[PDB]
Design a protein around this ligand. Structure first.
Ligand SMILES: COc1cc(Nc2c(C#N)cnc3cc(OCCCN4CCN(C)CC4)c(OC)cc23)c(Cl)cc1Cl
Ligand SMILES: [Cl-]
Length: 280
């Protein structure tokens, strides 16, 4: 549940390959030498270290099925190693790319439902995820999601990829955000944008340069689905309430769980069918 300075990671873990590409940085597939357990590993090279300690303490102290598990954190030579539960389905954005299509509404409903439960969990503990997007929603073969990353990939990219298309309007110009009573609501806006991304492959304003996107998010009316006819009234209403520019009136994850779009979702079937198809 923390970082081990007294251990060399190469005693525990063998590197067997690379996952994705893909800016944000190098992600390694690792295999435990004792157990055979698989991990995704990021290997990042005390003032550039306590940046990551908050994220590792989070991933350690979160016991929830829809959040990724920390399998090990090591500090050896100059590098910080973070070993995370391997999610064999990979990221949702990578799946949409493979199949050259967006998710169906039923599939989106499962992801949404599971993301809301995870965020309700995190927000009850005053943890804010800070980087929700399809790229940080990873999948199991059983058709569940795992919320990943928690900001780490963008902090590491800080040493047009990483443009914050998913960022809430109230914080789009901020490097660091104030502690306020509606700070966690920034995740809910990002959830909304992630749903549009899953519906359309790309988030709103994907065509624009990074600077222009900040301004566009700040100024524009909340984004809506490009082709409303394809989508239920529940989906559109859900987006409309989640994508509220005012963070005080924007609903919590608990409130959105009571919305018709997701309140009856009890099976992950649609997601299992999706992952089955991308394996084949
Ligand atoms: C360790 O650190 C981090 C790792 C991650 N990312 C990953 C975590 C985590 N966590 C877990 N598991 C992952 C699994 C992945 O792909 C495996 C499946 C490959 N495809 C299967 C389907 N076939 C057709 C094509 C290949 C993956 O791929 C890019 C990234 C993963 C992030 Cl997002 C942030 C941080 Cl900080
Ligand atoms: Cl603008």
């Amino acid at each position: 549940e923390h970082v081990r300075r007294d251990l060399d990671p190469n005693e525990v873990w063998e590197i067997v390959g690379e996952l994705g590409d893909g800016a944000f940085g190098k992600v390694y597939k690792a295999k435990n030498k004792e157990t055979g357990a698989l991990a995704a590993a990021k290997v990042i090279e005390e003032e550039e270290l306590e940046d990551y300690i908050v994220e590792i303490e989070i991933l350690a102290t979160c016991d929830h099925p829809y959040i990724v598990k920390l399998l090990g954190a090591y500090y050896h030579d100059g590098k910080l190693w973070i070993m995370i539960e391997f999610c064999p389905g990979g990221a949702v954005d990578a799946i949409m790319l493979e199949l050259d299509r967006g998710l169906t509404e039923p599939q989106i409903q499962v992801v949404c439902r599971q993301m809301l439960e995870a965020l309700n969990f995190l927000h009850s503990k005053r943890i804010i995820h800070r980087d929700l997007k399809a790229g940080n929603v990873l999948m199991t073969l059983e058709g569940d999601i795992r919320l990943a990353d928690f900001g780490v990939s963008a902090k590491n990219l800080k040493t047009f990829i990483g443009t914050p298309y998913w960022m809430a309007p109230e914080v789009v110009m901020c490097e660091t955000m104030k502690d306020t009573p509606y700070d966690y609501k920034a995740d809910i806006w990002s959830l909304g944008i992630t749903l549009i991304e899953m519906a359309q492959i790309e988030p709103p304003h994907h065509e624009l340069n990074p600077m222009r996107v900040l301004l566009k998010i700040a100024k524009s009316d909340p984004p809506t689905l490009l082709t409303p006819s394809k989508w239920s009234v529940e989906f559109r209403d859900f987006l409309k309430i989640a994508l509220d520019k005012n963070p005080e009136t924007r609903p919590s994850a608990a409130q959105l769980l009571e919305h018709p779009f997701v309140s009856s979702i009890t099976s992950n079937k649609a997601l299992r069918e999706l992952v089955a198809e991308a394996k084949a």
